[PDB]
C-alpha cells in the first residue's frame, strides 16, 4: 500500500562487466542463477533488476556484490539454479550474507574450494549485508514458475532504496 522510494544507480550501471542480462534498474530484486542455463530472460521479464549465472565462489561472488551495491534500489537477492560441485557457490553466497568475511578475506562458514574475496573489502561486505534485507534460498531449483513467483513476492514487499549513495568497489 506504498510508493517505494528510489535512487539513481551509479552512472553506467551495471559498471562491472560480466555474464548477466540487465532489467529495470529501479527493481528491488536481483537474481543469481548459479550453474543453470536459460533462467535469466524470464527473471528480467518478471521484473528483476539484473539476472545472471555465478560460477566461481570468489570472482563470481565479487562481481555480483559489486554490481548490487552500486544500485541502492536492490534490496533482495534470489539464489536459484543448480549448485556447482566443488565451488558450491550458492552455499558460499548464503554464508557471506549470514556471516560476513574474515580478516583474510575468507567467507566465514563457506564450504566451497576457494571462497576468498581479494578485492571486496570488509566495508563493502557490510554494505552488501545491510542493503540486502533478505536472501531467498531457491538453490537447486530450476522451476521458472516458482522463481518468478518469488520475484513478484519480493516486488510486492519493496521497502524502497537503501538511503545511501551508490557504493563503488574497484575489482581487478
Residue numbers in the entry: -1 to 170
Text taken from the publication that reported this structure:
In the methanogenic pathway from H2 and CO2, the membrane-spanning methyl-tetrahydromethanopterin (CH3-H4MPT):coenzyme M (CoM-SH) methyltransferase complex (MtrA–H) catalyses the exergonic methyl transfer from CH3-H4MPT to CoM-SH (ΔG°′ = −30 kJ/mol) coupled with endergonic sodium-ion gradient formation. The only prosthetic group required for catalysis is vitamin B12 (cobalamin) bound to MtrA. Here, we report on the X-ray structures of the B12-binding domain of membrane-associated MtrA from Methanocaldococcus jannaschii and of the MtrA homologue from M. fervidus in complex with cobalamin. Analyses of these structures reveal a cobalamin-binding site that differs from other B12-binding proteins in an unexpected manner and also provides initial hints of how the energy of cobalt demethylation is transformed into conformational energy used for the ultimate sodium-ion translocation process.
Primary structure analysis predicts MtrC, MtrD and MtrE as integral membrane proteins with at least six transmembrane helices, MtrA, MtrB, MtrF and MtrG as peripheral proteins with one transmembrane helix anchor, and MtrH as a peripheral protein without a membrane anchor. Membrane-associated MtrA devoid of the C-terminal transmembrane helix was over-produced in Escherichia coli 20 years ago in a soluble but cobalamin-free form, and the holoenzyme was reconstituted by unfolding and refolding in the presence of cobalamin11. However, cobalamin appears to bind less tightly to isolated MtrA than to MtrA in the MtrA–H complex. The structure of cytoplasmic MtrA complexed with cobalamin and the structure of the soluble domain of MtrA without cobalamin were essentially identical. This finding suggested that the MtrA structures observed in this work were relaxed forms.
